[PDB]
Design a protein around this ligand. Structure first.
Ligand SMILES: COc1cc(/C=C/C(=O)N[C@@H](Cc2ccccc2)C(=O)O)ccc1O
Ligand SMILES: COc1cc(/C=C/C(=O)N[C@@H](Cc2ccccc2)C(=O)O)ccc1O
Lengths: 193, 193
């Protein structure tokens, strides 16, 4: 039958137990999925030495994912684009396969709570029915500030793939992109503006 | 007909004109290929704030490419392995496709000149007949030291791929792995040993 993900019940890679205790309710609220056989789901975390709003300024830009994500040749949103839920983008993917475009829909965008997410709704690639949520969270300790970004997804496991290799793949990509996010926004922080 | 690559005649991404002028002869010697229609070739560079021998200690470890390369699930060399030209490794690749192993042969290993290279000799993936060379080079300016790593390859362009997308893919992967090499060996340098 279907089941609920348990991301909110264990400490994910990249997070401390202290940070987890502060985020458990957010993980439950935004990073929970009902998951069916044949799907995989994961939660990744990344610490960033930058203020929450600096990081959020990059995370929220649905029209420019290539600012922090790897393997993007181009991203188009057309002309009428406004940052509203329901908007779509066409991402041309860099892969060893022939050309492929991923069409992606903006599912969530909450600037007050720092939540966004999207769904892959078409394209010929290996993350069919992918859906993902990213949240941004601030931390402080004796005047020092930092941010944690949480990114979770659910996706279908292709016929002939094992669950483990689909999850390893998607996890590897998400982890690399959060590392890029960390570099980009830490640079932005060092420089001000 | 066949032609020679011109990597040694222009400044590659990631290198300064001053650094190029010092390396042009090495690019000619080690990063030249005779290339046929249907193949692509590229030269990438990466500056590393670490001594040449620190970087070389990681670059030369043919049995542990996952120390600096991305998307490696495992790498096996068996039991009799000695670091000699002709040895092979089986690299299990992380991809969105079903399981695949790349069998790779060590083509060059010169510890005096800091040159190594390998050939993909089998496996079902999209870099057929890939062959690559990596060289490591030291620089100094008023007591400050740094290293440049050059990595070139030639590879077949799969039927139905464009040249541009094969090169974009292989370039993206090589560039990410050299960035990882830079982080790993800069950390090793900061810590000594
Ligand atoms: C970069 O952004 C995105 C990336 C992806 C990539 C998915 C995928 O399956 N990629 C495969 C290559 C591949 C295989 C077969 C058909 C097409 C592509 C891989 O890399 O192994 C999806 C949405 C995105 O927004
Ligand atoms: C990580 O190390 C290596 C990586 C590669 C990857 C090659 C390749 O074509 N990868 C594809 C995915 C893919 C597609 C179809 C069949 C198998 C795989 C991609 O990612 O789009 C080769 C040698 C290596 O040593």
């Amino acid at each position: 039958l279907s089941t609920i993900t348990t991301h909110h019940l264990t400490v994910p890679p990249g997070l401390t137990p202290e940070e987890f205790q502060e985020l458990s309710s957010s993980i439950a609220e935004f990073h929970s999925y009902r998951i069916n056989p044949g799907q995989c789901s994961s939660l990744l975390a990344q610490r960033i030495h930058a203020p929450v709003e600096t990081v959020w300024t990059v995370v929220r830009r649905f029209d420019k994912p290539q600012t922090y994500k790897h393997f993007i040749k181009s991203c188009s949103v057309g002309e009428d684009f406004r940052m509203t839920v329901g908007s779509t983008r066409d991402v041309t993917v860099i892969s060893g396969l022939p050309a492929a475009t991923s069409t992606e829909r903006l599912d969530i965008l909450d600037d007050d709570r720092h939540v966004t997410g999207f769904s892959i709704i078409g394209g010929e690639h290996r993350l069919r029915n992918y859906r993902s949520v990213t949240t941004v969270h601030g931390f402080e300790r004796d005047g020092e500030i930092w941010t944690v970004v949480l990114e979770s997804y659910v996706v279908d496991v292709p016929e002939g793939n094992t669950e483990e290799d689909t999850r390893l793949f998607a996890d590897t990509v998400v982890k690399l992109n959060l590392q890029k996010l960390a570099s980009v926004t830490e640079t932005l922080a060092r420089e001000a503006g």
